[PDB]
């Protein structure tokens, strides 16, 4: 705990970390079973849920969604761009992962039966911690003590392992999920700043902002070695506290360094 504890004193909040080396089975854990707000990080699992549904509902991914302007939400750069023409379920899924597109996330949540439907998918793969309760943008409130729209670093990492490396998704769906996670058009740092430059990274960030709340999870492939899965989540006690990308990167470095 000691290096992580010092880091969270410099941050002024709480940090939760879980990392697993899928080769050795080694793990690093700090506050890994505490709850933290998901923020936009749920959008990675949302896309995985859509891919899983496609296995039982062939034709889903190519379905055109001709949404109206009322479906749009602040920070929906792709769905706003294509408002006049519409987008397929697959295109909305790519936008939700790669651009954190909020309207795309709400439209896809509708396809799955809402936040409860996404939560049920996570339960179906063995994740009993994840809960999504609200839609964009309400889910980002990050109020201290509120368990709505939260998970734990350990549950996030374990679920990400199952979906990107395990057999929770069929291999073609799995490869699509990985490919979406590897796209980095918003140019995020965080875990990407912690890994060696030759490692491949599939990541999804979250930035509630309020209460210094921000996070990142990733599957990372060291060249020629077994992949590592990790999650770093933060929150802070005061509404006005600023999140820190540098703290997330620093905690991710410690996690990678702490593995055996
Ligand atoms: Na350790
Ligand atoms: Na590589």
Structure description:
- The protein has helices at residues 2-11, 42-56, 77-81, 89-99, 102-111, 114-124, 153-164, 171-182, 191-194, 245-258; strands spanning 14-21, 27-30, 36-37, 64-65, 87-88, 150-151, 200-206, 214-221, 228-235.
- It has one domain (1-258): DD-peptidase/beta-lactamase superfamily (Beta-lactamase, 3-Layer(aba) Sandwich).
- It starts with a helix and ends with a helix.
- α2 packs antiparallel against α4 (89-99).
- The chain is an alpha+beta fold and 260 residues long.
- The protein contains ten helices and nine strands.
- The strands form three sheets. Strands 2-1-9-8-7 form a five-stranded antiparallel β-sheet, with helices on both faces.
- The structure holds sodium ion (NA) (2 copies).
- One sodium ion binds next to loops.
- One sodium ion binds at residues 28, 258.
Task: Tell me which CATH architecture applies here.
Answer: 3-Layer(aba) Sandwich
Strand content is 15-25%
- CATH class designation: Alpha Beta
Q: How many domains comprise the coordinates?
A: 1
Query: Helix amount, in percent?
Result: 40-55%
Overall SS class? alpha+beta
- Characterize the overall form: globular
Enumerate the distinct ligands. Answer: sodium ion
CATH superfamily: DD-peptidase/beta-lactamase superfamily
Count of alpha/pi helices: 10
SSE string, helix = H, strand = E? Answer: HEEEHEHEHHHEHHHEEEH
The CATH topology comes to Beta-lactamase
Radius of gyration: 17 Å
Largest sheet: 5 strands, antiparallel
**What is the spatial order of strands in the main beta sheet?**
2-1-9-8-7
Strand element count:
9
Separation of the first and last Cα atoms? 16 Å
């Amino acid at each position: 705990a000691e290096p992580f504890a010092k880091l969270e004193q410099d941050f002024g909040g709480s940090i939760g970390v879980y990392a697993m080396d899928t080769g050795s089975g080694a793990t690093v854990s700090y506050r890994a079973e505490e709850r933290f707000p998901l923020c936009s990080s749920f959008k990675g699992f949302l896309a995985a849920a859509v891919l899983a549904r496609s296995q039982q509902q062939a034709g889903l991914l190519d379905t055109p969604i001709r949404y109206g302007k009322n479906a749009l939400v602040p920070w929906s750069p792709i769905s706003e761009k294509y408002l006049t023409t519409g987008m397929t379920v697959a295109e909305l899924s790519a936008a939700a992962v790669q651009y954190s597109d909020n309207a795309a996330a709400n439209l896809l949540l509708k396809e799955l039966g809402g936040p409860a439907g996404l939560t049920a998918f996570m339960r179906s793969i063995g994740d009993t911690t994840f809960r999504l309760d609200r839609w964009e943008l309400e889910l980002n409130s990050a109020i201290p003590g509120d368990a709505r729209d939260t998970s734990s670093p350990r549950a996030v990492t374990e679920s990400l392992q199952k979906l990107t490396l395990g057999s929770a998704l069929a291999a073609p769906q799995r490869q699509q999920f990985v490919d979406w996670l590897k796209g980095n058009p918003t140019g995020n740092h965080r875990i990407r700043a912690a890994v060696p430059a030759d490692w491949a990274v599939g990541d999804k960030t979250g930035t509630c902002g309020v209460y210094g709340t921000a996070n990142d999870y990733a599957v990372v492939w060291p060249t020629g070695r077994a992949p590592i899965v990790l999650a770093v989540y933060t929150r802070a006690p005061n509404k006005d506290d600023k999140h820190s990308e540098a703290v997330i990167a620093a905690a991710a470095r410690l996690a990678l360094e702490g593995l055996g």
